[model samples]
Target chain A: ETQRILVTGGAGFIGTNLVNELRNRGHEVLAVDLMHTEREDYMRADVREYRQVERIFEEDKFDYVYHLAAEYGRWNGEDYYENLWKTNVIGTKHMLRMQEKLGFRMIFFSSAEVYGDYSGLMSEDVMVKNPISDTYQMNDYAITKWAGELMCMNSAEMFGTETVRVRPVNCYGPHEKYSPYKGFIPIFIYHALHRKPYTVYKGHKRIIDYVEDSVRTFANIVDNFIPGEVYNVGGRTEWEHDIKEYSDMVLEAVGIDDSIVTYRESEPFTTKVKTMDFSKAIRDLKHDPQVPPEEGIRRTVEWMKWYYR
Target chain B: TQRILVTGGAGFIGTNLVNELRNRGHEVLAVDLMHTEREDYMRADVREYRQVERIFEEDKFDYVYHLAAEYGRWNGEDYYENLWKTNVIGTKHMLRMQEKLGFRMIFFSSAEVYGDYSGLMSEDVMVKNPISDTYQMNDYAITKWAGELMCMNSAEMFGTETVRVRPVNCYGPHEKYSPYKGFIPIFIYHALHRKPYTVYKGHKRIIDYVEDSVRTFANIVDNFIPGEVYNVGGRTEWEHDIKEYSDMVLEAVGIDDSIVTYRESEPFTTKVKTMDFSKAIRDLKHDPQVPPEEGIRRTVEWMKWYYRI
Candidate 1:
């Protein structure tokens, strides 16, 4: 089936990879994004504005919209909260309105941050299975992402819309630019690439999945298209490691020593280890990760070295 | 000898709060999103962190009253962009500042947060339940509950001190025209200008005067208790039917009941909303100097003079 797919945040790192994977799979994909790009399939639009979002759907129809656009950061909400809520919360609401009116299937991009220090296996329905009072939505980003999921779920019940929620756990790869507020992968990778200084909290454990792995799984949802389903998309459990190990992998890939990396003994942000359950995605979306952190780090180092050069 | 900051200080409740705080011999600075030339006024949107950060840097406040929000339910449905951003993100920015600067904050949650309650409801302090425990009836309720949730989360995560309030239906002068505003203002504004307005027969609510509500609010800082919740509104017996309030508005304007349409209860709208203010009475010495009849008369006069009708 030649599906007309609209990839929001198409110019973004994961969106870029997802668009490529979809295009390669013979789906007719149009990439909508805020950044100006020379690609013919890419159109520039701010998801925060209703007029802009409406303009895209008016010109063409979509079978499934991969909503990947958001205000990206962790504690960045402390500084850029307006962007965080407007783009993440209201932006998703705007997409939901369009989904309701057009009756298009959607893949809403939520984050594993929604798990919020649950200190257990991060599975789908964790929000529902646990008592709402006992739940932990730590920061604005976590709260907004969960709010997006709730809006998506509520709209499905109210408007009879079909949608799937996908939560990515520490995904990393090419096309990811470096910013101070980004994830440990990019922050560590970019710093080692430039021989700059960065910190690695020792106690934290995480699993980093390559974008190629996550994108294929995200694109696979159209085949299943089971409405009201959520999946935790991440790497294999064997890939989980401490923060220093991932940092060391980045340092090794970039041919740099640990001098650029400062190791700190502290509990990173919320959960000591963001242990997740990816068995649902494996059963449903065929979410198989071929690129381990070591392989992904080497690939990212080569790309950043060339891109920055 | 204290300095206070009031977000949404140009709003109806905020204006009354600022005046009352200033009258009690305090140096109160009103930081509103709107541009105003009034003395001790700082124009800054709570949604914008940079703007809020600059205001905080300029003023060393002992207390803050966070009353800024997208008020009504219909307003959220129509303009959820502003509603979610102003209500959720705006409130989060205030929490971040309170976390860092260590200022006692009075966060304004709405009585609408008690979505499951039918009879006159008491504060969560009396029930010993968090607002998140309730069934969020609307997007407006959900956002207010989210704001209070953020405040409590900050208190737990960062050790911040804050009080929360759920104002039922505070109405008086300084509330400019908005079709999505409360029924009291909508009815009074429509009746004043010789325009027709609809009144649902089944709906009822307890409306409080702005002066009375603000007076109780002004005492919060003086008797501040961290993590306390207050339900501030008029007397329990003052809760009246929509038809009764409409008649009072018409009577106050010295107009016939001609330009009014009687209708059944609106769909997706709550029939009645009531709250218990016993906690505020015991703690803040809450007192209502004016009843609905007197407040309605005063509001009509203020509208007439303001609009020169």
Candidate 2:
């Protein structure tokens, strides 16, 4: 049976992609986003405001929801801390309240950044261990996301909401946007597209999950709603490669043989390596990574080439 | 001499803690959310990360006692978000600061985390059943439980030596008397003013005198035990009938039975919570130094002098 789905943050890179996939599967989709984007048939609604979001819930009884909306970035400034709490933590709470009244299965988009500075591959079990750093508390994005995940878990246990949580790490693909502190894919792809010298955060290794695989994993969790279950959705690429090597691949994908990519000189090299074990997702949700790292970068490079030109 | 930091230094327990710490020949930095009558008290909202970090940077504290929280039983629905920010987020900021400075810290949780578990709520009984539906409806208990979890995990994740204490209802000279907060203060306020002392029928509370509570907190800091949770309560007579206690308050103030009254207990107010603080007594020599009647009389005397009744 086809379902009616609400995709919050539906205009963003992953949300837009998830919405497309859900629509293609013959499901009715209502896209809500705060930002104005090229994606048509979208409603502008701030999730932080309860009355506005509650009105939408009253209008349509959604069968399932993909909560991907967040204030997405690592470091902006101390001023954005309250805004991060508003959108990331309080916004998720508003949805939980609405879900308590209007029954709907929710798929919360949690992140692996919640597990800060853990050395090995992180599994769902590691969350209980709470591999977070003291330094992570300064990172408001990480603190809010972790708190949001806790909210989802508490909502399910306390309110009897059927909520599935998926923690995705290092997601990269087409339509990815740029920030000074976010998404290495767009930064690399943009610099390669412009043929400009880009700063490579050397010695950093990450397992990049293509956006398509990330969205598919989210869909799988929604299809088989497991109340109070957490899944780690990540790339099939078991090996963690240096971010510089990934940058070179972006240059190769853009057909630039000789490109200028310099190591950040004034910046101290903080070794940030991300890896996640998705065996549980594969076992329970039947999640499979369809796009290889190289192919994902090539696709994103192709899109950046067109968009930049 | 030990250099200590008390987060809620302007609060009831905080004021007592700061005074005790100073009496012991220790230097203390008192940080609170508001400006207070105390000259040494520094103002820093725990929800504001930079302000908290700034205090840590300036003070160079060797030990921290985190007593800061948006506390109380229940308000209506409007206060949940603020309660969450102050309790949960505020605790996180302190944990981060402690982790960075490598300080042995003591975080004050409450008996509310035990939820509705009535019989001898111990340090090890981790299950939190909802107490009264009215009381559990608020964010206070949930935030306390969340903060406890964060502290336990932080001990493992950050390797910062930490201790947790769950103090049951505290009453003393410094406690702010309001009808909305606790029973003892309101009882004192009503009796001192010759006003009608209202009591909920069949409602019972275990009250810990502030002197005992404050001493246990100071002892926990001085001992510096890591990864331990202690339930710091008071004498067994601490738990008492609400109406009978109101009568005692009326009689104590020479008012006789003229102004004592009773109201039907709310449907969710039937449960009585009794705690087992034997672990603290055995381990830390945390003796309940004051008798219930003595403590109650002391508080009443202080109230009469302070309020000029």
Candidate 3:
């Protein structure tokens, strides 16, 4: 079916990719992003301001709208909590209010971090309550994100407005944000390419998921069109390893293993690892990562070398 | 019959807990903030000691779940006054009444008392954590946790069996019309009417459905874990991310996939980090039977049916 789509956060990582996909699919797209760019179909405005968001709705009616413009932070983990509440939680609250006035379908872009820190396996049935760690702190991201999700849940049940939430885990692909300030792969790629004398932390392991596969999964979930289907946009499988080991992989990939990588004595307080489980998306979405970790790394390296790094 | 006294019985979880217990052939004396409506629903705000004492004088309850509170997310004008009267002084009054009447109480505490733990902080880890510096912030969490402390102190000092349950984010049927809190149930109600949802600023949340939470409450009331605190959510290992569950809720209600309006900008103070419920499940035998999806469906159906949609 033909549709006019309004894509919020169209300039950000996943938002940009989703915008390109929607445009390619022949849907008329209104790209609303808080990009610092002018004359780029972007609104350099925060979603917190209800009037500003409402202005967009006043201009034209749309069949579908995607809210992907929530703030995300991860340095010391508290950043996400602090900003996500304003950008993700409160921002989504404002947007939901606008949706009440303006009639349209909205696909809320949510993160997998909403699950908080978990062990073993994770699926749709997994019941998480009482966040015990800093990761689960309501102030950070989980509480705020959960608040957004609740917005959809309550709104859908009460108002019958159609919507769904897609949780993309470790999302990385073309147009991905690169900042040593946050995100694992992006920092690794940037540091490796720039030849920064970085010291990898010891005794830490993480599960890395490819982004392209995640985006594809997102598209599939949207295409399938279940009113309130919560889909996990994750890779084919989990990639768990220590940061030092990952540094070794990067050094090997760069053909400078002999001259690359270092370790710190103090270890800088040892950054906590993200132990997660994602199986429900795999089962229901039947999603498979087209590029395995190795291939995904190579593609990401190519993108970094050519564009980002 | 098990004579049970449930405070805040007219409120969300308290009423459900009372219902659960009454359904199980238990004699229930409900103390609530009801205004001259039902005879059984006693008009006793726990904030007032005299009212609570009078109720205690009227009937002798075997077990009590003290769930009354004047909760607030943001710092309102009368935060301290309300909190002091309701949580602190009211709890003191309850203790006095319990002492005079010679009975124990199951106090309803909050996970927020555990200020902010990004990682999975166990219930056994810290006991006397303070939430935030803001008076309102400190008021809700500090009062609740401190009140639990008072219960423990009273338990030891006066030989009262005071069990505390730290419940996480709860959403289900019959939630009060508060300016703050209960976003899930409120949003569900509005979404059923095709109204816009307010997405708070933050990442997704780890939610505790009310049915399971109420079940946890019942467990706390039936048995006494003297001077000990129990965290009741669901299975700690399995918790659904807020976004994932919200999508499921929307789908369950047969809402459109795009009607969800998202707000990505707003300010939020309280962000629930993470939680652990092993103590409750292992020790207290508290099990959350209903998953969020099923609970949302059940709540949505009831809401729709009640609203005559």
Ranking by DockQ: 1, 2, 3
The digit string of per-residue lDDT tens for model 2 on B147-181 reads 76677656765788888888887888888786566
The list of candidate 2 runs beyond 4 A from truth reads A36-39, A76-79, A128-139, A195-204, A237-239, A257-259, A262-273, B1-10, B18-68, B72-78, B88-169, B176-208, B215-288, B291-309
Tens-digit lDDT track for model 3 on B1-309?
A: 678888888777877888888888888977877684654678887765568777877767888888888765443213534554576557767877777777778888777666445556466644322221211233366556556555754665468877787777777776643456566766676667676565554544556778777766776655666777777775555555445655776787777636555655343344444667778777767777776667778878777766778
Worst 10 residues of 1 chain B by lDDT: B124-133
Clashing pairs in 2: B116-B131
DockQ for each numbered candidate: 0.24, 0.11, 0.03
Better of 1 and 3 by DockQ: 1
Q: What is the lDDT of residue A201 in candidate 3?
A: 65
Question: What lDDT would candidate 1 get against the real structure?
Answer: 0.84
lDDT of 1 by residue, B196-270 (tens): 898889888889999999999999977999989888899888989988999899899889889989988876566
Clashing pairs in 1: B121-B276
Worst 10 residues of 1 chain A by lDDT: A127-136
Chain A TM-score values for every predicted structure, listed in order = 0.97, 0.92, 0.83
